[PDB]
Amino acid sequence: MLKREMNIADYDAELWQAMEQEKVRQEEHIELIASENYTSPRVMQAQGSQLTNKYAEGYPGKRYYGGCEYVDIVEQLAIDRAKELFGADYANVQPHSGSQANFAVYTALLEPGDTVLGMNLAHGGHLTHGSPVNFSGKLYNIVPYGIDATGHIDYADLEKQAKEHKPKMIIGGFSAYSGVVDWAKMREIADSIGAYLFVDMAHVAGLVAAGVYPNPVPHAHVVTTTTHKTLAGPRGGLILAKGGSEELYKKLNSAVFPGGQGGPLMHVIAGKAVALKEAMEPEFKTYQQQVAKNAKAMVEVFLERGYKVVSGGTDNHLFLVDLVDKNLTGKEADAALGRANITVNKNSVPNDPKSPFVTSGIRVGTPAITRRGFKEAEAKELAGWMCDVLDSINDEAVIERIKGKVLDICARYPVYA
Amino acid sequence: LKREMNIADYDAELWQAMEQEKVRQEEHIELIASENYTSPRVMQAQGSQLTNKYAEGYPGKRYYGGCEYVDIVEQLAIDRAKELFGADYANVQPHSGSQANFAVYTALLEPGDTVLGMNLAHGGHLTHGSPVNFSGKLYNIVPYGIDATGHIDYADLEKQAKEHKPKMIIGGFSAYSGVVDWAKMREIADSIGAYLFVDMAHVAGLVAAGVYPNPVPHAHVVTTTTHKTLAGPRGGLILAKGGSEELYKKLNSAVFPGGQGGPLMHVIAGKAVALKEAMEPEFKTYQQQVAKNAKAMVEVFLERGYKVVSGGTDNHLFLVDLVDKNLTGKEADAALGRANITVNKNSVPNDPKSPFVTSGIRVGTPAITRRGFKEAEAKELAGWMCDVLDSINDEAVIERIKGKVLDICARYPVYA
Ligand SMILES: Nc1nc2c(c(=O)[nH]1)N(C=O)[C@@H](CNc1ccc(C(=O)N[C@@H](CCC(=O)O)C(=O)O)cc1)CN2
Numbered sequence A: 001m002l003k004r005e006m007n008i009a010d011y012d013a014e015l016w017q018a019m020e021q022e023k024v025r026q027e028e029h030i031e032l033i034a035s036e037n038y039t040s041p042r043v044m045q046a047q048g049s050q051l052t053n054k055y056a057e058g059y060p061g062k063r064y065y066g067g068c069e070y071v072d073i074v075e076q077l078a079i080d081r082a083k084e085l086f087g088a089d090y091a092n093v094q095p096h097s098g099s100q101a102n103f104a105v106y107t108a109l110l111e112p113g114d115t116v117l118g119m120n121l122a123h124g125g126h127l128t129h130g131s132p133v134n135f136s137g138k139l140y141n142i143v144p145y146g147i148d149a150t151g152h153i154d155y156a157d158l159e160k161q162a163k164e165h166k167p168k169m170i171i172g173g174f175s176a177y178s179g180v181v182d183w184a185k186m187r188e189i190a191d192s193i194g195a196y197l198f199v200d201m202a203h204v205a206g207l208v209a210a211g212v213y214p215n216p217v218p219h220a221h222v223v224t225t226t227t228h229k230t231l232a233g234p235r236g237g238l239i240l241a242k243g244g245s246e247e248l249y250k251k252l253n254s255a256v257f258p259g260g261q262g263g264p265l266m267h268v269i270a271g272k273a274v275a276l277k278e279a280m281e282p283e284f285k286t287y288q289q290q291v292a293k294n295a296k297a298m299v300e301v302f303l304e305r306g307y308k309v310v311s312g313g314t315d316n317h318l319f320l321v322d323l324v325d326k327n328l329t330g331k332e333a334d335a336a337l338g339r340a341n342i343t344v345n346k347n348s349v350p351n352d353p354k355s356p357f358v359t360s361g362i363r364v365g366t367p368a369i370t371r372r373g374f375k376e377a378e379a380k381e382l383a384g385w386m387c388d389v390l391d392s393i394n395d396e397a398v399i400e401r402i403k404g405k406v407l408d409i410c411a412r413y414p415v416y417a
Numbered sequence B: 001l002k003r004e005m006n007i008a009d010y011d012a013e014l015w016q017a018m019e020q021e022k023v024r025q026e027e028h029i030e031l032i033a034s035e036n037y038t039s040p041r042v043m044q045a046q047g048s049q050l051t052n053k054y055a056e057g058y059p060g061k062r063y064y065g066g067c068e069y070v071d072i073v074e075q076l077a078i079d080r081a082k083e084l085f086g087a088d089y090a091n092v093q094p095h096s097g098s099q100a101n102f103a104v105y106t107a108l109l110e111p112g113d114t115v116l117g118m119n120l121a122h123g124g125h126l127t128h129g130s131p132v133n134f135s136g137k138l139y140n141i142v143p144y145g146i147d148a149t150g151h152i153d154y155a156d157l158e159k160q161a162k163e164h165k166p167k168m169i170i171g172g173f174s175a176y177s178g179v180v181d182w183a184k185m186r187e188i189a190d191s192i193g194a195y196l197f198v199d200m201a202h203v204a205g206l207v208a209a210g211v212y213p214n215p216v217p218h219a220h221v222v223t224t225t226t227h228k229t230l231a232g233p234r235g236g237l238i239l240a241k242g243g244s245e246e247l248y249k250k251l252n253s254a255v256f257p258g259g260q261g262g263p264l265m266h267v268i269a270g271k272a273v274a275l276k277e278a279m280e281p282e283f284k285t286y287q288q289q290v291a292k293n294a295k296a297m298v299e300v301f302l303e304r305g306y307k308v309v310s311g312g313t314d315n316h317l318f319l320v321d322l323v324d325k326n327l328t329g330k331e332a333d334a335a336l337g338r339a340n341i342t343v344n345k346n347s348v349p350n351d352p353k354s355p356f357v358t359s360g361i362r363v364g365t366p367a368i369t370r371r372g373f374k375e376a377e378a379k380e381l382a383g384w385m386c387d388v389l390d391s392i393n394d395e396a397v398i399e400r401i402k403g404k405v406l407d408i409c410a411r412y413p414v415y416a
């Protein structure tokens, strides 16, 4: 018998103290990391449940272990809600993460060595979209594509590359692009050469769910997404598809298991189920709208203050600030802002003269501050403080003043009340 | 977002399914060798706010700001993993055992390299070479199994090693009840300059308690899950000892940015506390009971006339070959399930049936032991199992046994 009262506090002081400090840090810091958010206590409740004790390999109704009658219901709920929210007729909720979800797609549709057309990392693409240090770049033949001098995808050049290299798959999606991708146009290009159009909408899933950003589901053969970014759910992956054959769906299911994973995390999947339900609320829709609005408000300030915003603006939740002309590395800016309790992340920019760990820019996202209560007024004021720090990056007095101002606005907008 | 938000009043359907699973875990005797009951401390960590943090990279060398505290959490997990197993290297980021293994493969091998791994039907894991897994698809797998006696023949293993000259030899299993000679395998590996990779997922808890030989000092790399006999959260772990800085750098890179993205910090916090609990003296006596209970159950099965692969067990599990009884593992599994005895169908050496059907069942004692069962209860339970298997079509027999397990389950609650 394990007493339900056993806790970390009176048993592991070291670990507990670290956890409590992170809890406070989430309240005292303005999080502007585009890929982060604040999941609801409902999601955390699911993740802390006893579903963690169950091994449930296989799929609902067709498992490899006995006693899965109830976890089957849990997984089916996640599957059904994922389909209804995005308008898909197929969904796999078992991927442990976005990376695992993508790995499943690659291995289900391609053979090692096949040619793939994906967005280059510095230009906004994700590691799993072709980076040579990731499994994607190591196992497949990657042909990259980037953005214009205007900061947008040139579908004309994309078509040229597609026709010239004849890739077996074309990847649409990004980790740091602020524009709207024309999914239908990419599908056309893919069809012209008989390639698969794979769209990774991890970053914009929440926006797509609210109708604030074009849904790729009806244009791509396969779609993947994480459940922890703009979707504001638990950390995990998800695979979606529409209008595919039963064979295609069977391959996708097999690629996830027993192809690339073992037992799924049922407690996390329960979290996905409730998060997908919350994403159906009307308030979730107005939330995503504020997210997009706040991102625009912040861009205005940055431009007025004389900073280079890649693509000149944003149509989603994020934007990149190119610091090359300011003679600053993303690493420096990140550290300086951090001292003012403003947390962002250094980020490569198109044609970045520095390596990924250093970079010449920072990425800014509004999902967290918006979920926290911020609106345009607060977002604009915040962008101003950021520029004040960047202007006098070496003035300790400036950083101190800003820090006090953020600790202040943070106290008025608690994350978890 | 208000702290008072919860699932019960907002999502009745999900909550109802969760509550039923909660009750099921109390009313069922779980004998699935790979399952256990993690402590409320681990669940508490997994339900924390650490789930909100992106922390790619390693402590002190992250790709995002604001990782001062999650860094402490991960370092705690790393340090305790090293001390518990006597390793000088540990990676706590793998999302699972499969991801941990994938990292090892990609760090040490090139697609197409030859690998010597234990065949699935004979006790090996999917990631040890199965053709339906990434391991069998990306690499050239040469399999090895067990004797007619049910044990690994190191003489045959050495022959295969010398003949195929594999770049890596995998030691480890998902359904083998014996003791593997790690040192002997290292010798074989050295004779051909191959890497000895040991996946100790199933016996990690036993190894931690000293009840089973530790492979860490013999293998070049070791992996394990944290949710089986180690009784922690679901996740993977990589360990090593005496390797070079270069080897360790490769392993770290293989995990990230090689095969994963952001780690699950809330789960890692769970790993940290679970590893601390595994250091308790009571944990050691617990693993001992686990081994003892497994033996007590095997005796009964043999007396009752059932075939136990390998004729016995030296760990927490054992396989029951049902070929001679004209039963499929799928049938036995379903019958036992109706009596609230949960096991899992399992392939057996030279199984005439496919993996979804099988001709056997695997039995493990970690769960019932963690629940309070001792030899007496374990023996009585094995008896009930045989009663069901004997009269697999007698609903009256199944009903009587069911009443009995519900009865004993009430005396040994899992969580209170
Ligand atoms: N465009 C873009 N931004 C993003 C991501 C991405 O995938 N794409 N990330 C998505 O999570 C995070 C950054 N993750 C990265 C992690 C490792 C490497 C990398 O290339 N590392 C090499 C070289 C490092 C060095 O500079 O010394 C390596 O580890 O060998 C790059 C980005 C956040 N920003």
Ligand SMILES: Nc1nc2c(c(=O)[nH]1)N(C=O)[C@@H](CNc1ccc(C(=O)N[C@@H](CCC(=O)O)C(=O)O)cc1)CN2
Binding pocket: A057, A064, A258, A262, A263, B120, B121, B122, B123, B124, B125, B126, B127, B130, B132, B174, B175, B344, B345, B346, B347, B354, B355, B356, B357
């Ligand atoms: N020896 C052993 N036992 C184990 C495992 C293992 O890896 N090895 N598992 C570790 O988790 C679970 C069983 N998992 C398995 C999952 C899929 C297949 C498999 O080969 N499936 C093929 C064919 C299925 C069929 O029979 O129709 C497939 O999916 O195509 C086998 C075992 C439990 N028992």
Ligand SMILES: Cc1ncc(COP(=O)(O)O)c(CNCC(=O)O)c1O
Binding pocket: A035, A096, A097, A098, A099, A100, A102, A126, A128, A173, A174, A175, A200, A201, A202, A203, A226, A235, A236, B054, B260, B261, B262
């Ligand atoms: C487009 C995209 N795809 C997949 C992933 C992988 O997810 P996991 O971290 O759960 O593996 C990410 C994560 N990107 C993190 C960031 O942009 O900061 C992503 O941005």
Ligand SMILES: Cc1ncc(COP(=O)(O)O)c(CNCC(=O)O)c1O
Binding pocket: A055, A261, A262, A263, B034, B095, B096, B097, B098, B099, B101, B125, B127, B172, B173, B174, B199, B200, B201, B202, B225, B234, B235
């Ligand atoms: C030896 C071994 N290795 C790796 C894994 C992979 O773990 P994940 O399920 O977390 O990916 C397992 C799981 N085996 C489950 C079972 O034996 O029933 C295993 O037994």
